[PDB]
């Protein structure tokens, strides 16, 4: 798996022949702690009546586990959990690769996976946070053969997106329960701010489970942890070799 | 904690079968008493580097080298000023008089002998540049190497 | 400064890593707690991470006929001895024409410069 991790359900016989519909929704985009997950849901077009009962608009942790059990013959899923170390390395690398472009390349990957597995996908639904105009145009150019639809209210608009959101939320919960007292994980939480400060190493800093790339994670390090400077913040022979005559000792 | 130094010393310094002194640069030195030999110190200082020694950190990323030295370059400043601190122990070593008969009871500095001796080192460094393969054009390159160990190179 | 050969002959082995970043303040660090369990053996050397940044490593050995020593302070005793150190680079392993690789070629060149 290395950085990310893909967990998938076997393709049901109906999906490869009958025309299908895809839904994309995320979980764990804002916390400083833990990994980010991305989940997709696919069902044949006539079987949209069955998913009309397991659609939201919010739901409690016990209800989301119950909804995930029912989805688990016609409904297929695929996950993509990106580790907090991978997120830290993606953004903190010599070339800035922002969370928006990190989340959206994970979305296009799972859609390609479904097309690589043999699912007869004809239309794709996507859930966003803010302006979908720039997001729709990018995924329409990536997948020209299929009708791409991006909405911010997608989870509350269509059952395919709500089912893909329940799958992303349960996987995010299962992963943090596997690691387990911090609180929620979000930067705004005062109990989360209290946990980070109590887990700072002067040389190293925070552990792998902490997304360093966050403005909240970068600020604390500047106060408690030691100052670390990186590559981006004849006489010719030795200057080229980086050598000089000793005088310090 | 305390300051740590990452050194690269010659293999023969392990067996007993040494002192560090600050001698004036011809253009820190290590000297042996039991073996009688002079060595120079060279530090590798690169921008943005730090060591991870066992279970401790050491900023700077300094790499020290204990490389040998021909005393003829070190003792040269004593007779260069005439033209025609720890310096005392530097000269008083066995086989110095026979070594002196290249540059200089009585001792006098000569330019004609020094010019012939420096011309041999250029031809001696040209083979090292051919053995270690450093990137004929070697003439000015080999001349520039001895220029960092002597002030008379401006006249040469 | 002056020191005997007995400390140089009875020095315990050490683990060394050359980071491409500078860690301003010297002192103890829990390497075996954070850095060591993070190290991953790959096809392009080793891979670990520091302060959320991906690092690519390569094992660099002491030049032939030499031995590495770690000195602490007149008398400066040798606390440890080594045969190799792990060289690290940001995002990609340090190239063959690196400043670190160049300085190691020096004693081989220096052996013929100061020759009799």
Coordinates of C-alpha atoms in Angstrom, one line a residue:
Chain A
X1 CA 0.0 0.0 0.0
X2 CA 2.9 2.4 1.0
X3 CA 1.3 5.9 1.1
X4 CA -2.4 5.4 0.3
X5 CA -4.5 2.2 0.6
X6 CA -7.2 0.8 -1.7
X7 CA -9.9 -1.6 -0.3
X8 CA -12.5 -2.9 -2.7
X9 CA -15.6 -5.1 -3.0
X10 CA -15.9 -7.7 -5.9
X11 CA -17.8 -6.4 -9.0
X12 CA -21.4 -7.9 -9.1
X13 CA -22.4 -9.7 -12.4
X14 CA -25.1 -7.0 -13.2
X15 CA -22.6 -4.1 -13.2
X16 CA -20.5 -5.3 -16.1
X17 CA -23.5 -5.6 -18.5
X18 CA -26.3 -3.2 -17.4
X19 CA -25.7 0.6 -17.5
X20 CA -24.3 1.8 -14.1
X21 CA -24.2 5.2 -12.2
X22 CA -21.2 6.4 -10.0
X23 CA -21.0 8.6 -6.9
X24 CA -18.0 10.3 -5.2
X25 CA -17.8 11.8 -1.7
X26 CA -15.0 12.4 0.8
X27 CA -14.4 12.1 4.7
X28 CA -11.5 13.6 6.7
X29 CA -10.6 16.7 4.6
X30 CA -10.2 19.2 7.5
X31 CA -8.6 17.4 10.5
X32 CA -4.9 17.9 11.5
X33 CA -5.0 14.3 12.8
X34 CA -5.6 11.0 11.0
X35 CA -5.8 9.9 7.4
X36 CA -8.2 11.1 4.5
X37 CA -10.5 8.6 2.8
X38 CA -12.3 8.7 -0.6
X39 CA -15.2 6.3 -1.4
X40 CA -17.2 5.5 -4.6
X41 CA -20.6 3.7 -5.0
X42 CA -21.9 2.0 -8.2
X43 CA -25.3 0.4 -9.1
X44 CA -27.3 -0.4 -12.3
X45 CA -29.7 2.4 -13.4
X46 CA -33.0 0.3 -12.8
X47 CA -31.8 -0.5 -9.2
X48 CA -32.0 3.2 -8.1
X49 CA -35.3 2.4 -6.3
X50 CA -33.5 0.2 -3.7
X51 CA -31.0 2.9 -2.9
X52 CA -33.8 5.6 -2.5
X53 CA -34.5 4.1 1.0
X54 CA -30.8 4.3 2.1
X55 CA -30.2 8.0 1.3
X56 CA -29.7 11.0 3.7
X57 CA -31.5 14.4 3.0
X58 CA -26.5 14.4 9.7
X59 CA -26.7 10.6 10.6
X60 CA -25.3 9.3 14.0
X61 CA -22.3 6.9 14.2
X62 CA -24.6 3.9 15.1
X63 CA -27.0 4.7 12.1
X64 CA -24.0 5.0 9.6
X65 CA -22.7 1.6 10.7
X66 CA -26.2 0.1 10.2
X67 CA -26.5 1.8 6.7
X68 CA -23.1 0.4 5.7
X69 CA -24.2 -3.1 6.7
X70 CA -27.2 -3.0 4.3
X71 CA -25.2 -1.9 1.3
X72 CA -22.7 -4.7 2.0
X73 CA -25.7 -8.4 -5.4
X74 CA -26.1 -5.0 -7.2
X75 CA -24.3 -2.4 -5.0
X76 CA -20.4 -2.2 -5.3
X77 CA -17.9 -0.1 -3.5
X78 CA -14.2 0.9 -3.6
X79 CA -12.2 3.0 -1.0
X80 CA -8.9 5.1 -1.1
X81 CA -7.4 5.9 2.3
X82 CA -4.5 8.4 2.1
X83 CA -2.2 8.2 5.2
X84 CA -1.4 11.4 7.3
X85 CA 2.3 10.9 6.4
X86 CA 1.4 10.7 2.6
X87 CA -0.6 14.0 3.0
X88 CA 2.3 15.6 4.9
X89 CA 4.8 14.5 2.1
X90 CA 2.5 15.4 -0.8
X91 CA 2.2 19.1 0.4
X92 CA 5.5 19.6 2.1
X93 CA 7.5 18.3 -0.9
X94 CA 9.9 20.7 -2.9
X95 CA 6.9 21.3 -5.2
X96 CA 3.6 22.5 -3.5
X97 CA 0.8 20.0 -4.3
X98 CA -2.2 21.6 -2.4
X99 CA -5.0 19.5 -0.6
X100 CA -7.5 20.5 -3.3
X101 CA -5.4 19.0 -6.1
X102 CA -4.5 16.0 -3.7
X103 CA -8.3 15.2 -3.1
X104 CA -9.3 15.5 -6.8
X105 CA -6.6 13.2 -8.2
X106 CA -7.8 10.5 -5.7
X107 CA -11.4 11.1 -7.1
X108 CA -10.4 10.6 -10.8
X109 CA -8.3 7.5 -9.8
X110 CA -11.3 5.5 -8.3
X111 CA -13.5 6.5 -11.3
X112 CA -10.7 5.1 -13.6
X113 CA -10.5 1.9 -11.4
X114 CA -14.2 1.2 -11.9
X115 CA -13.7 1.7 -15.7
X116 CA -10.6 -0.6 -15.5
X117 CA -12.6 -3.3 -13.6
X118 CA -15.3 -3.5 -16.4
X119 CA -18.3 -1.7 -14.7
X120 CA -20.6 -0.3 -17.5
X121 CA -20.6 3.3 -16.1
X122 CA -22.6 5.8 -18.1
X123 CA -22.9 8.8 -15.6
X124 CA -20.9 10.1 -12.6
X125 CA -22.0 12.1 -9.5
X126 CA -19.5 14.2 -7.4
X127 CA -19.8 16.0 -4.0
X128 CA -17.7 19.2 -3.5
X129 CA -17.1 22.0 -1.0
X130 CA -17.6 25.3 -2.9
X131 CA -17.3 26.2 -6.7
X132 CA -18.0 23.0 -8.8
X133 CA -17.6 24.9 -12.2
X134 CA -13.8 24.5 -12.3
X135 CA -14.0 20.9 -10.8
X136 CA -16.7 19.7 -13.4
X137 CA -14.6 21.0 -16.4
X138 CA -11.5 19.1 -15.1
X139 CA -13.3 15.8 -14.6
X140 CA -15.3 16.2 -17.9
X141 CA -12.0 16.7 -19.8
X142 CA -10.5 13.6 -18.0
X143 CA -13.6 11.4 -18.7
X144 CA -15.0 12.7 -22.1
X145 CA -17.0 9.6 -22.9
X146 CA -19.2 9.9 -19.8
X147 CA -21.6 12.6 -18.5
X148 CA -19.9 14.1 -15.4
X149 CA -22.0 16.0 -12.7
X150 CA -20.5 17.9 -9.8
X151 CA -22.7 19.4 -7.0
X152 CA -22.0 20.6 -3.5
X153 CA -25.5 19.3 -2.3
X154 CA -24.8 15.9 -4.0
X155 CA -25.1 13.9 -0.8
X156 CA -28.6 15.4 -0.2
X157 CA -29.5 15.4 -4.0
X158 CA -28.8 11.8 -5.1
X159 CA -28.7 8.3 -3.3
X160 CA -25.5 7.2 -5.1
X161 CA -23.5 10.1 -3.4
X162 CA -25.1 9.5 0.1
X163 CA -24.1 5.8 -0.1
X164 CA -20.5 6.8 -1.2
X165 CA -20.4 9.3 1.7
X166 CA -21.5 6.7 4.4
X167 CA -18.8 4.4 3.0
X168 CA -16.1 7.2 3.3
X169 CA -17.3 8.2 6.9
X170 CA -17.3 4.6 8.3
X171 CA -13.8 3.8 6.8
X172 CA -12.5 7.1 8.4
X173 CA -14.0 6.1 11.8
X174 CA -12.7 2.4 11.5
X175 CA -9.2 3.7 10.8
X176 CA -9.0 6.1 13.9
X177 CA -10.6 3.3 16.1
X178 CA -7.7 1.0 14.9
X179 CA -5.1 3.6 16.0
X180 CA -6.8 4.0 19.5
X181 CA -7.7 10.9 23.9
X182 CA -7.5 13.9 21.4
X183 CA -11.1 14.8 20.8
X184 CA -12.4 15.4 17.2
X185 CA -9.2 16.0 15.3
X186 CA -10.2 19.3 13.7
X187 CA -7.9 22.4 14.3
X188 CA -10.8 24.5 15.8
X189 CA -11.3 22.0 18.7
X190 CA -9.5 23.2 21.9
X191 CA -9.0 19.6 23.1
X192 CA -7.2 18.8 19.8
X193 CA -5.0 21.9 20.2
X194 CA -4.2 20.6 23.7
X195 CA -3.3 17.1 22.5
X196 CA -0.8 18.3 19.7
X197 CA 1.1 20.6 22.2
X198 CA 1.5 17.6 24.6
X199 CA 3.0 15.5 21.7
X200 CA 5.9 17.7 20.4
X201 CA 9.5 16.5 20.1
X202 CA 12.2 19.2 19.9
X203 CA 14.1 17.3 17.2
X204 CA 11.4 15.3 15.5
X205 CA 8.1 17.0 16.3
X206 CA 4.7 15.2 15.9
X207 CA 4.1 11.5 15.0
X208 CA 3.0 10.0 11.5
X209 CA -0.7 10.3 12.5
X210 CA -0.3 14.1 12.5
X211 CA -0.7 16.0 9.1
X212 CA 2.3 18.4 9.4
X213 CA 1.2 20.4 6.2
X214 CA -1.6 22.1 8.2
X215 CA -1.2 25.7 9.3
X216 CA -2.1 24.5 12.9
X217 CA 0.6 21.8 12.8
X218 CA 3.3 24.2 11.3
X219 CA 2.6 27.0 13.9
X220 CA 3.1 24.7 17.1
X221 CA 6.5 23.3 15.6
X222 CA 7.8 26.9 15.3
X223 CA 7.3 27.5 19.1
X224 CA 8.1 24.2 20.9
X225 CA 10.3 22.2 18.4
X226 CA 13.8 23.2 17.3
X227 CA 14.5 25.4 14.2
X228 CA 15.2 23.2 11.2
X229 CA 16.4 24.9 7.9
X230 CA 16.0 23.0 4.5
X231 CA 17.0 23.5 0.9
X232 CA 14.3 26.2 0.3
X233 CA 14.4 27.9 3.8
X234 CA 42.5 26.9 -7.5
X235 CA 39.6 28.4 -5.3
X236 CA 37.1 27.0 -7.9
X237 CA 37.9 23.3 -7.0
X238 CA 37.3 23.5 -3.2
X239 CA 34.2 25.8 -3.8
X240 CA 32.8 23.1 -6.2
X241 CA 33.7 20.4 -3.6
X242 CA 32.4 22.4 -0.7
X243 CA 35.7 22.0 1.2
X244 CA 37.7 24.7 3.1
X245 CA 40.9 25.0 5.3
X246 CA 40.3 24.3 9.0
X247 CA 40.6 27.1 11.6
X248 CA 37.7 26.2 14.0
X249 CA 39.6 23.5 16.0
Chain B
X1 CA 24.7 18.2 25.2
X2 CA 28.4 18.5 24.3
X3 CA 30.0 19.4 20.9
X4 CA 30.8 16.3 18.7
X5 CA 33.4 16.1 15.8
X6 CA 33.0 13.7 12.8
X7 CA 36.6 12.8 11.9
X8 CA 38.2 10.5 9.1
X9 CA 41.6 9.6 10.5
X10 CA 44.3 7.3 8.9
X11 CA 44.1 3.6 9.8
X12 CA 47.6 3.5 11.4
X13 CA 46.5 5.9 14.2
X14 CA 44.7 2.9 15.9
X15 CA 47.9 1.0 16.8
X16 CA 50.5 2.3 19.3
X17 CA 53.6 0.4 17.8
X18 CA 49.4 12.5 18.8
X19 CA 48.8 16.3 19.5
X20 CA 46.8 19.0 17.8
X21 CA 48.5 22.5 17.3
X22 CA 47.4 25.8 15.7
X23 CA 50.3 26.6 13.4
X24 CA 50.4 29.7 11.0
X25 CA 48.8 28.9 7.6
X26 CA 51.5 29.1 4.8
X27 CA 48.9 30.6 2.4
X28 CA 44.8 23.6 13.0
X29 CA 47.3 20.7 12.4
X30 CA 47.7 17.2 13.9
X31 CA 51.2 16.1 14.8
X32 CA 52.6 12.7 15.9
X33 CA 55.3 12.4 18.7
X34 CA 55.8 8.6 18.8
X35 CA 55.7 8.2 15.0
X36 CA 57.0 11.8 14.1
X37 CA 54.7 13.2 11.2
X38 CA 52.7 16.3 10.4
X39 CA 49.0 16.2 9.2
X40 CA 46.6 19.0 8.2
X41 CA 42.9 19.4 9.1
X42 CA 40.2 19.9 6.5
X43 CA 36.5 20.5 7.3
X44 CA 33.6 19.7 4.9
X45 CA 31.0 22.5 5.4
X46 CA 27.9 22.4 3.2
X47 CA 24.9 24.7 3.5
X48 CA 22.0 22.9 5.3
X49 CA 23.3 19.6 6.9
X50 CA 23.1 17.8 10.3
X51 CA 24.3 14.4 11.8
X52 CA 22.3 11.7 13.6
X53 CA 25.0 10.2 15.8
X54 CA 23.5 7.0 17.4
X55 CA 20.8 8.7 19.7
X56 CA 21.9 12.4 19.3
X57 CA 21.8 15.3 16.8
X58 CA 24.7 17.4 15.7
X59 CA 24.0 20.5 13.5
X60 CA 26.4 21.8 10.7
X61 CA 27.2 18.5 9.0
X62 CA 31.0 19.0 9.4
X63 CA 33.3 16.3 8.1
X64 CA 36.9 16.5 9.3
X65 CA 39.8 14.8 7.5
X66 CA 43.3 13.8 9.0
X67 CA 45.4 14.0 5.8
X68 CA 49.2 13.9 5.6
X69 CA 51.5 17.0 5.0
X70 CA 55.1 17.5 3.7
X71 CA 56.8 19.7 6.3
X72 CA 58.6 21.6 3.5
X73 CA 55.4 23.8 3.0
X74 CA 54.9 24.4 6.8
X75 CA 58.6 25.3 7.6
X76 CA 58.8 27.6 4.4
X77 CA 57.3 30.7 6.2
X78 CA 60.4 30.7 8.5
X79 CA 62.8 31.5 5.6
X80 CA 60.3 33.1 3.1
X81 CA 60.4 36.6 4.8
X82 CA 64.2 36.9 4.3
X83 CA 64.0 36.1 0.5
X84 CA 67.8 35.5 0.3
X85 CA 53.9 29.9 18.6
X86 CA 54.0 26.1 18.3
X87 CA 56.6 26.5 15.4
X88 CA 59.5 25.1 17.6
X89 CA 58.2 21.4 17.8
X90 CA 57.1 21.6 14.1
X91 CA 60.7 21.7 12.7
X92 CA 62.5 19.5 15.4
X93 CA 61.7 16.0 13.9
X94 CA 64.0 13.2 12.6
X95 CA 65.0 13.4 8.9
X96 CA 64.4 17.2 8.5
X97 CA 68.0 18.3 7.4
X98 CA 67.8 15.9 4.3
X99 CA 64.3 17.2 3.6
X100 CA 65.5 20.9 3.9
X101 CA 68.0 20.4 0.9
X102 CA 65.1 21.1 -1.6
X103 CA 64.0 24.7 -0.8
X104 CA 66.8 26.0 1.5
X105 CA 74.4 24.1 11.2
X106 CA 73.9 27.1 8.8
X107 CA 70.8 27.3 6.6
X108 CA 70.1 29.7 3.7
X109 CA 66.9 30.1 1.5
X110 CA 67.3 29.6 -2.3
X111 CA 64.8 30.5 -5.1
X112 CA 66.4 28.3 -7.9
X113 CA 66.1 25.1 -5.8
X114 CA 62.5 26.0 -4.7
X115 CA 61.5 26.7 -8.4
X116 CA 62.8 23.2 -9.4
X117 CA 61.1 21.5 -6.3
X118 CA 57.7 23.2 -7.0
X119 CA 57.9 22.1 -10.8
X120 CA 58.2 18.5 -9.7
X121 CA 55.1 18.6 -7.4
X122 CA 53.0 19.9 -10.4
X123 CA 54.1 16.8 -12.4
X124 CA 53.4 14.7 -9.2
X125 CA 49.8 16.1 -8.8
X126 CA 49.1 15.6 -12.6
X127 CA 49.3 11.7 -12.1
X128 CA 46.9 12.0 -9.1
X129 CA 44.5 13.9 -11.4
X130 CA 45.0 11.0 -13.8
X131 CA 44.6 8.2 -11.1
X132 CA 41.6 9.7 -9.2
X133 CA 40.3 11.2 -12.5
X134 CA 39.5 14.9 -11.8
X135 CA 37.2 16.8 -14.3
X136 CA 47.3 19.0 -21.8
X137 CA 44.8 21.2 -19.8
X138 CA 46.2 19.7 -16.5
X139 CA 49.1 22.2 -16.5
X140 CA 47.2 25.3 -15.1
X141 CA 44.9 22.9 -13.0
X142 CA 47.9 21.2 -11.2
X143 CA 49.6 24.6 -10.7
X144 CA 46.4 26.0 -9.0
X145 CA 46.4 23.1 -6.5
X146 CA 49.8 23.9 -4.9
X147 CA 48.8 27.7 -4.9
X148 CA 46.6 27.0 -1.8
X149 CA 49.6 25.8 0.2
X150 CA 52.2 28.5 -0.6
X151 CA 52.2 32.4 -0.9
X152 CA 55.1 32.5 -3.5
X153 CA 52.6 31.1 -6.1
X154 CA 51.7 34.7 -7.0
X155 CA 55.4 35.0 -8.3
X156 CA 55.1 31.5 -9.8
Chain C
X1 CA 44.6 18.9 22.3
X2 CA 46.1 15.3 22.7
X3 CA 44.6 11.8 22.9
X4 CA 45.9 8.1 23.1
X5 CA 45.2 5.1 20.7
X6 CA 43.5 3.0 23.5
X7 CA 40.2 4.9 23.2
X8 CA 40.5 4.6 19.3
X9 CA 41.0 0.8 19.6
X10 CA 38.2 0.2 22.2
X11 CA 35.4 2.4 20.6
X12 CA 31.9 0.8 20.3
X13 CA 30.2 0.8 16.8
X14 CA 27.9 3.8 15.9
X15 CA 24.9 4.6 13.6
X16 CA 25.2 7.9 11.6
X17 CA 22.7 9.7 9.2
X18 CA 23.6 12.8 7.1
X19 CA 20.4 14.9 6.8
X20 CA 20.0 17.5 4.0
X21 CA 18.6 19.9 6.6
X22 CA 20.2 21.6 9.7
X23 CA 18.9 20.9 13.2
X24 CA 20.3 24.1 14.9
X25 CA 20.5 22.8 18.6
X26 CA 22.8 19.8 19.5
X27 CA 21.8 17.3 22.1
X28 CA 20.0 13.9 22.6
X29 CA 17.4 12.8 20.0
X30 CA 15.1 9.7 20.0
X31 CA 16.2 8.4 16.5
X32 CA 15.2 4.8 17.3
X33 CA 11.8 6.1 18.4
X34 CA 11.0 8.2 15.3
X35 CA 13.5 8.0 12.4
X36 CA 14.6 4.3 12.6
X37 CA 11.1 2.6 12.6
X38 CA 10.2 5.0 9.7
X39 CA 13.0 3.7 7.4
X40 CA 11.7 1.6 4.4
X41 CA 14.0 -0.5 2.2
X42 CA 13.2 0.2 -1.5
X43 CA 14.7 -0.3 -4.9
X44 CA 16.2 3.2 -5.0
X45 CA 17.9 2.9 -1.6
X46 CA 16.0 3.7 1.7
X47 CA 13.0 5.9 2.4
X48 CA 12.0 7.8 5.6
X49 CA 10.6 11.2 6.6
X50 CA 11.5 14.2 8.8
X51 CA 9.1 17.1 9.8
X52 CA 6.6 15.8 7.2
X53 CA 9.1 15.8 4.3
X54 CA 9.9 12.7 2.1
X55 CA 13.6 11.7 2.2
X56 CA 15.5 9.2 0.0
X57 CA 18.5 7.5 1.5
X58 CA 21.7 5.7 0.4
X59 CA 24.4 3.9 2.5
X60 CA 27.8 5.6 2.0
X61 CA 30.9 3.8 3.2
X62 CA 34.2 5.3 4.6
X63 CA 36.9 5.6 1.8
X64 CA 39.2 2.5 1.3
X65 CA 41.9 2.1 4.0
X66 CA 40.3 4.5 6.5
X67 CA 38.0 4.4 9.6
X68 CA 35.4 6.9 10.8
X69 CA 35.6 8.2 14.4
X70 CA 33.2 10.3 16.6
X71 CA 35.2 12.7 19.0
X72 CA 34.0 14.5 22.2
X73 CA 36.2 17.0 24.3
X74 CA 43.2 19.5 26.5
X75 CA 42.0 16.0 25.4
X76 CA 39.4 14.9 22.8
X77 CA 38.3 11.2 23.4
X78 CA 36.8 8.9 20.7
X79 CA 33.3 7.9 22.0
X80 CA 32.6 5.6 19.0
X81 CA 33.9 4.1 15.6
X82 CA 32.1 3.5 12.2
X83 CA 32.6 1.9 8.7
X84 CA 29.6 3.6 6.9
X85 CA 26.9 6.3 7.3
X86 CA 23.4 6.7 5.8
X87 CA 23.4 9.7 3.3
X88 CA 20.0 11.4 2.9
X89 CA 18.5 13.7 0.2
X90 CA 15.3 15.7 -0.2
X91 CA 12.6 13.9 -2.3
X92 CA 15.4 12.1 -4.3
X93 CA 18.7 10.4 -3.3
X94 CA 21.8 12.7 -3.6
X95 CA 23.4 12.4 -7.1
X96 CA 26.9 11.0 -8.0
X97 CA 28.2 14.6 -8.5
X98 CA 27.2 15.7 -4.9
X99 CA 29.4 17.8 -2.6
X100 CA 29.4 14.9 0.0
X101 CA 30.7 12.4 -2.6
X102 CA 33.4 14.7 -3.8
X103 CA 35.1 15.2 -0.4
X104 CA 35.5 11.4 0.1
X105 CA 37.6 11.2 -3.1
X106 CA 40.1 13.6 -1.4
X107 CA 42.4 11.2 0.8
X108 CA 43.1 9.1 -2.4
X109 CA 44.2 12.3 -4.2
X110 CA 45.9 13.6 -1.0
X111 CA 48.0 10.4 -0.7
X112 CA 49.8 11.2 -4.0
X113 CA 50.0 15.1 -3.5
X114 CA 52.1 14.9 -0.2
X115 CA 54.1 11.9 -1.6
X116 CA 57.9 11.6 -1.1

